[PDB]
Design a binder for this molecule. Structure first.
Ligand code: CLA
Ligand code: CLA
Ligand code: CLA
Ligand code: CLA
Ligand code: CLA
Ligand SMILES: CC(=O)O[C@H]1CC(C)(C)C(=C=C/C(C)=C/C=C/C(C)=C/C=C/C=C(C)/C=C/C=C(\C)C(=O)C[C@@]23O[C@]2(C)C[C@@H](O)CC3(C)C)[C@](C)(O)C1
Ligand SMILES: CC(=O)O[C@H]1CC(C)(C)C(=C=C/C(C)=C/C=C/C(C)=C/C=C/C=C(C)/C=C/C=C(\C)C(=O)C[C@@]23O[C@]2(C)C[C@@H](O)CC3(C)C)[C@](C)(O)C1
Ligand SMILES: CC(=O)O[C@H]1CC(C)(C)C(=C=C/C(C)=C/C=C/C(C)=C/C=C/C=C(C)/C=C/C=C(\C)C(=O)C[C@@]23O[C@]2(C)C[C@@H](O)CC3(C)C)[C@](C)(O)C1
Ligand code: KC2
Ligand code: KC2
Ligand SMILES: CC1=C(/C=C/C(C)=C/C=C/C(C)=C/C=C/C=C(C)/C=C/C=C(C)/C=C/C2=C(C)CCCC2(C)C)C(C)(C)CCC1
Ligand SMILES: CC1=C(/C=C/C(C)=C\C=C\C(C)=C\C=C\C=C(C)\C=C\C=C(C)\C=C\C2=C(C)CCCC2(C)C)C(C)(C)CCC1
Lengths: 154, 176, 166, 167, 143, 70
């Protein structure tokens, strides 16, 4: 079926969803899951590194994640949005392709993959889940205390 | 089942031909060390400890050669090293070891037709190498090993005369 | 044949059960009883060395759970009513809850094991090998516990603390 | 098998009490997983309630919790549970959670939750099926009450006067 | 789990079907670039390429030119971009002349008419892109 | 050895290493019996186990002494 099932929880699906949903709906769910995990991993790494190492912008932007983005200039935000939009139109074209594999920009249906490929895909998925929880935790902590992750840990 | 440890099986190497055999080899060194090498080492340590015990006891009692320091056995090593005549006890040890142990050691390691460990054929008086006198040698040597260990670690600990106990004969005999 | 394994197999250096094999069941019952009380007492010593209950031992008296030492002095500093309550609790638990002898002395249950005093509601291992191993460790821990408990009692009698000098 | 599982509390309903229909669309493996989570919550709640009762009443060890940080059990007990706890080293807390994590990793590898709905390897006290189901139901009811009790205690001490009694 | 296989199931072609060469991302980006996009006429391909290159060609000359620290820095940069674009389209025209000597098909980059249309689109697009970049850099205060 | 805490730490580290070690896929933690380990590896099982036990014991003892825990 898919790769997400793991030892600690098994096939975690209390509330249905998987059944009574179209294959297109399942592909959309897995694409959204992988996108969330990847973006959350990027956010976690960015917050962790930018807490204690932010050389850009003359080192003046705050370590608070929720205020550093406010202090970033408008042109930088526009360029980041343009880059993300370009990545997303590539994702849309990949969706329109007839051999789409939710989340697989690499292809990977055209190579002799084995169980190690599924294991590594599960590694990506579980790290993405952990980052999904962690990034929202980081943002909530920044809103509450005003400190970033590592500053809070101090 | 070994005769000494009645809940373990004796090693095949020990058998019963060697003198002093009692099936005592719980951790089986005899498979990783040749038995002849182990026996040579056993007899060397046993003989050195027998001589060490008798010499320590004699010097503590007061038997001293002329011109030597008049000190107890605990400080005798330092006193002899300071006074100088202590490398000439190493020199005969050096020639004996270099010219009898190293060749004998390599014979035991390599040669199949070699004398057993600890056998130098040293029988001037011809008293005899019977299996009673080998058993007596081994038993006395093992007792001397344990006795020397006790003597040194008690003399260094307590710093007292020949009994090497805090109270004296009173610890060996609590009735006193 | 339970009890007998280890460094020393059967070990009857005076031949009690060898002379009187009919009394082996009684001796096993006594051994298990002593081992059980010994494990309880040893755990009591270990846990009283570290943890003491908060609260008054008796409102009528001026004694707290913290003022008692851990030993004969601690048992001495209890009200007689509390001591009587302890004694009657032990009496009920040993007479009606866990009677080793169905009837009189030397009359342990033939159908049940010598130390089978628990009721229906108890942990049971439905495997002969596992049951045998668990009973063997039970009796062996009982022996070790009672030897150690005699050690603790003598140390506390002599010095005052169960731990001896280091 | 929502009806197969033991836990239907006659006090609230003769059958399974699922107001919001969360088990209507659920797999047998996920049902076992949810029961395992319920049992783990139950068992943690009872132990936490007993720990609260012991630490709040004044029970504590006789000692120092860290030689290099000047900590003691008596200070934690005097501070209170919510505070005293806050009064523990972070390293000791991480060691406690690491021990619990090692136990959970070992037990989940040995006894997967989806395969075994909280049935770990501890021995059984009764083999009669009727008594077995009665004991399981008693466990679940006691643990439900323990969950409610520990949350009530937390709300009582954190927010004063939030529970009628708080013994 | 092999990830490098023969190119188009041909072990004896001098290529490999690596993730870089053959992955869906590479295929999508390349096939959707103007030079490979489907349905675009050669004029449209040349136009898109032209504006894309002429927009960025001004910047090096503007910032790092000899007259960077002069009031006419941007004008000099634009003239430099225009000259470079003139050289580029001259290169394109002579390349078409040398390569597509005899041809009558048209509507294909590998034909004389198609390459001429592509070069025309490139020239117009590059001039327009350089001019637009000049306007943006003049009105940089907007951003 | 001098201190009872040091002796306890060294003994615990040695026992932990001997229990959790694995040679060629065989170990006590991996459910290989003591008698089978003894026959397969001999006193090499104790020598390596206690050598690494002493290494980890030295590491933890020196760390605790540096941290003041001991
Ligand atoms: C929003 C992100 C997201 C999405 C889209 C999915 C999607 C999927 N997961 Mg899930 N998953 C996620 C996050 C997500 N997951 C996280 C963070 C974890 C860690 C606990 C897991 C753990 C997990 C496991 C262990 C497994 C799956 C599986 C699945 C698949 C089947 C279940 C399904 O249809 O869910 C649909 C999900 C949604 C529609 C998302 C919204 C859900 C509700 C409406 C709201 C959010 C819930 C809750 C309020 C959380 C926020 C509160 C707080 C924490 C802030 C599907 C591809 C299974 C699989 O792949 O089997 C082949 C599987 O085995 N997931
Ligand atoms: C590092 C140590 C460690 C490890 C490896 C685990 C591992 C596990 N725990 Mg956890 N657990 C830990 C510490 C740890 N626990 C501690 C210290 C406690 C307190 C006693 C608990 C109490 C606990 C309970 C009560 C439950 C688990 C469950 C689980 C399992 C699911 C994890 C999950 O989905 O989390 C996801 C975590 C969240 C979504 C955040 C929860 C935060 C709440 C809302 C506050 C998994 C076997 C669950 C289980 O077995 O389910 C079948 C379960 O029911 N754990
Ligand atoms: C008093 C509440 C209570 C009850 C009724 C039960 C009942 C049960 N537990 Mg237990 N359990 C409890 C508290 C309780 N538990 C707590 C607080 C913990 C954490 C230490 C556990 C941890 C635990 C585990 C890890 C497991 C069980 C399991 C069991 C079953 C084993 C048979 C048994 O001994 O039952 C009879 C129990 C009693 C008569 C309670 C006696 C208590 C007094 C104070 C002594 C049974 C359903 C096993 C199972 O299969 O669960 C589904 C299992 O694997 N329990
Ligand atoms: C290779 C080394 C080098 C470098 C770095 C420079 C740099 C420079 N020279 Mg030059 N110069 C060099 C060698 C070099 N020179 C040599 C060998 C000579 C002797 C003949 C000269 C003689 C010379 C003179 C006489 C003058 C300069 C000047 C300049 C400046 C502007 C030149 C200009 O307009 O460029 C225009 C460049 C471009 C239009 C394009 C450059 C390449 C682009 C940026 C590459 C981008 C690649 C991209 C990442 C690919 C992937 C993209 C994909 C992912 C989408 C600049 C500082 C002028 C000045 O004012 O100096 C301060 C000047 O008057 N140079
Ligand atoms: C749980 C017990 C324990 C404790 C409390 C400590 C504590 C300590 N160890 Mg460790 N240690 C332990 C177990 C323990 N060790 C064990 C079992 C071993 C294996 C034998 C070691 C082996 C070891 C070594 C070899 C070293 C330490 C060092 C240290 C100190 C610095 C650690 C650090 O942050 O490195 C700094 C953090 C880094 C990321 C350094 C990165 C360096 C690379 C080359 C880049 C610290 C006092 C170091 C020291 O200086 O001790 C005084 C040291 O050199 N330990
Ligand atoms: C009831 C129900 O439903 O389920 C139950 C059923 C069942 C079967 C009962 C269960 C169980 C198990 C239980 C309750 C087990 C309890 C076991 C127990 C309580 C075992 C104590 C041992 C103490 C010893 C050996 C003491 C040695 C003491 C020694 C060696 C000493 O001499 C002490 C000392 O030398 C030191 C160390 C330090 C030195 O300075 C000197 C001194 C002298 C001071 C379950 C399965 O868990 C649940
Ligand atoms: C069938 C048949 O015919 O026979 C059968 C049946 C029959 C007759 C019933 C049997 C029996 C029963 C028998 C013979 C039982 C014997 C039991 C026995 C012999 C029990 C000793 C306990 C000693 C203790 C607890 C000592 C504590 C000692 C303590 C706490 C001290 O510290 C004492 C102390 O002095 C020191 C050490 C030092 C001083 O500074 C301080 C003080 C003064 C305080 C047999 C054997 O089954 C044979
Ligand atoms: C009318 C009323 O209540 O109003 C108010 C009062 C008050 C007080 C304010 C309130 C509260 C709090 C409440 C209600 C608290 C409830 C607390 C509750 C119900 C606490 C159970 C503990 C059970 C334990 C610890 C069991 C351990 C059991 C263990 C460790 C075992 O020995 C079991 C076991 O070893 C055996 C025997 C056999 C072996 O195989 C192994 C296992 C592990 C299986 C409320 C909510 O406001 C309501
Ligand atoms: C062995 C277990 C045991 C059980 C099963 C048990 C049961 C009951 C029951 C229920 C059936 C009641 C109703 C009850 C009542 C009281 N118990 Mg009691 N009790 C046990 C043990 C002890 C000990 C050791 C002491 C003690 C005491 C008191 C006092 C006195 C308080 C005071 O002094 O103010 C009162 C009122 C203390 C005492 O006698 O003090 C003079 C004391 O030391 N109990 N006790
Ligand atoms: C889950 C229970 C648990 C277990 C199974 C367990 C096992 C072991 C073992 C293995 C046999 C060793 C060898 C060991 C060693 C140390 N433990 Mg540890 N420990 C547990 C719990 C706690 C708590 C709560 C604390 C603690 C501590 C320390 C300190 C440092 C003390 C100091 O700071 O002076 C040292 C050296 C304290 C601490 O780190 O305090 C900052 C502290 O508070 N432990 N601990
Ligand atoms: C992919 C990618 C990348 C890259 C990028 C790029 C390469 C970019 C570029 C960009 C650019 C380079 C842009 C451009 C633009 C342009 C424009 C916008 C133009 C316009 C123009 C116009 C509008 C014109 C007009 C005209 C004409 C046409 C002619 C006549 C005149 C006039 C003026 C009218 C990177 C590395 C980041 C990484 C990730 C991925
Ligand atoms: C993207 C791409 C590519 C490439 C890449 C790379 C990685 C690089 C490049 C590079 C390059 C390609 C560079 C260039 C450079 C240039 C320069 C450096 C120039 C300069 C010039 C000048 C300076 C001029 C001047 C003038 C004028 C304008 C006119 C008159 C005369 C004079 C001289 C005055 C390829 C092909 C692969 C493919 C397609 C795409």
């Amino acid at each position: 079926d898919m790769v997400g099932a793991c030892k600690p929880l098994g096939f975690f699906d209390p509330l249905g969803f998987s059944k009574d949903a179209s294959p297109a709906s399942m592909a959309k769910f897995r694409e959204a899951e992988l996108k969330h995990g990847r973006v959350a991993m990027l956010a976690c790494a960015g917050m962790i590194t930018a807490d204690k190492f932010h050389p850009l912008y003359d080192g003046k932007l705050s370590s608070n994640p929720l205020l550093a983005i406010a202090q970033v200039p408008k042109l930088g935000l526009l360029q980041i949005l343009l880059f993300i939009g370009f990545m997303e139109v590539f994702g849309i074209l990949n969706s329109r392709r007839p051999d789409y594999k939710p989340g697989d920009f690499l292809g990977s249906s055209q190579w002799d993959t084995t169980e190690v490929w599924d294991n590594y895909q599960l590694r990506e998925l579980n790290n993405g889940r952990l980052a999904m929880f962690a990034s929202i935790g980081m943002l909530t902590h920044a809103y509450i205390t005003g400190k970033g992750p590592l500053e809070l840990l101090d | 089942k070994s005769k000494s440890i009645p809940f373990l099986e004796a090693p095949p190497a020990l058998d019963g031909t060697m003198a002093g055999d009692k099936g005592f080899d719980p951790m089986r060194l005899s498979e990783v060390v040749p038995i002849q090498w182990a026996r040579e080492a056993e007899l060397k340590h046993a003989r050195i400890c027998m001589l060490a015990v008798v010499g320590w006891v004699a010097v503590d009692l007061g038997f001293t050669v002329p011109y030597a320091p008049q000190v107890s056995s605990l400080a005798a090593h330092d006193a002899a090293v300071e006074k100088g005549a202590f490398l000439f006890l190493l020199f005969p040890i050096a020639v004996v070891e270099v010219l009898a142990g190293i060749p004998k050691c390599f014979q035991i390691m390599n040669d199949p037709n070699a004398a057993p460990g600890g056998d130098y054929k040293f029988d001037p008086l011809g008293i005899g190498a019977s299996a009673d006198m080998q058993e007596k040698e081994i038993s006395n040597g093992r007792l001397a090993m344990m006795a020397f260990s006790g003597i040194v670690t008690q003399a260094a600990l307590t710093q007292a005369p020949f009994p090497y106990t805090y109270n004296g004969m009173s610890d060996l005999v609590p009735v006193l | 044949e339970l009890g007998a394994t280890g460094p020393l197999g059967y070990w009857d250096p005076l031949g009690f059960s060898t002379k009187q094999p009919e009394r082996f069941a009684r001796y096993r019952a006594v051994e298990l009883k002593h081992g059980r009380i010994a494990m309880a007492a040893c755990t009591g010593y270990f846990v009283q060395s570290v943890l003491r209950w908060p609260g008054y031992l008796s409102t009528s008296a001026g004694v707290k759970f913290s003022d008692l030492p851990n030993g004969i002095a601690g048992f001495a500093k209890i009200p007689p009513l509390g001591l009587a309550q302890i004694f009657l609790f032990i009496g009920l638990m040993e007479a009606f809850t866990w009677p080793f002898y169905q009837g009189g002395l030397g009359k342990v249950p033939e159908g049940k094991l010598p130390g089978d005093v628990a009721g229906d509601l108890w942990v049971r291992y439905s495997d002969p090998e596992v049951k045998k191993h668990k009973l063997n460790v039970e009796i062996n821990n009982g022996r070790a516990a009672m030897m150690g408990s005699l050690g603790m009692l003598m140390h506390d009698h002599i010095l005052g603390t169960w731990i001896p000098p280091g | 098998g929502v009806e197969d599982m033991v836990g239907a509390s006659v006090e609230v309903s003769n059958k399974v009490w699922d107001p919001l229909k969360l088990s209507a669309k659920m797999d047998e493996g996920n049902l076992n997983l949810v029961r395992a989570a319920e049992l783990k919550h139950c068992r943690v709640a009872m132990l936490a309630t007993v720990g609260w009762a012991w630490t709040a009443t004044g029970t504590h060890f006789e000692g120092m919790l860290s030689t290099s940080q000047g900590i003691s059990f008596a200070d934690a007990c005097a501070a209170g549970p919510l505070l005293g706890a806050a009064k523990v080293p972070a390293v000791g807390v991480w060691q406690i959670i690491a021990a619990i994590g090692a136990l959970e990793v070992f037990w989940e590898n040995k006894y997967p939750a989806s395969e075994c709905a909280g049935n770990f390897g501890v021995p059984w006290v009764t083999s009669d099926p009727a008594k077995m189901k009665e004991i399981q139901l008693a466990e679940l009811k006691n643990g439900r009450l323990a969950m409610i009790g520990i949350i009530s205690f937390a709300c009582a001490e954190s927010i004063p006067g939030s529970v009628p009694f708080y013994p | 789990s092999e990830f490098v296989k023969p190119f188009n199931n041909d072990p004896f072609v001098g290529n490999l079907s690596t993730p870089v060469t053959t992955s869906t991302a590479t295929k999508l980006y390349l096939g959707n670039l103007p030079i490979y996009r489907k349905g675009l006429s050669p004029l449209m391909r040349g136009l898109e390429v032209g504006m894309a290159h002429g927009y960025f060609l001004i910047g090096p000359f503007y910032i790092l030119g000899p007259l960077r620290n002069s009031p006419n820095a941007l004008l000099v940069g634009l003239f430099s971009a225009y000259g470079l674009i003139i050289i580029l389209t001259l290169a394109l025209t002579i390349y078409g002349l040398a390569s597509f000597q005899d041809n009558s098909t048209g509507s294909n980059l590998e034909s004389s008419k198609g390459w001429r249309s592509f070069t025309s689109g490139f020239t117009v697009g590059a001039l327009g892109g350089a001019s637009v970049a000049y306007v943006l850099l003049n009105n940089v205060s907007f951003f | 050895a001098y201190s009872i805490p040091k002796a306890f730490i060294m003994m615990f580290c040695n026992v932990l290493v001997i229990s959790t070690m694995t040679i060629q896929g065989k170990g006590l933690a991996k459910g290989t019996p003591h008698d089978e380990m003894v026959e397969s590896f001999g006193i090499t099982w104790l020598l390596a186990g206690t050598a690494l036990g002493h290494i980890v014991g030295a590491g933890t003892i020196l760390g605790c002494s540096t941290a003041g825990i001991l």
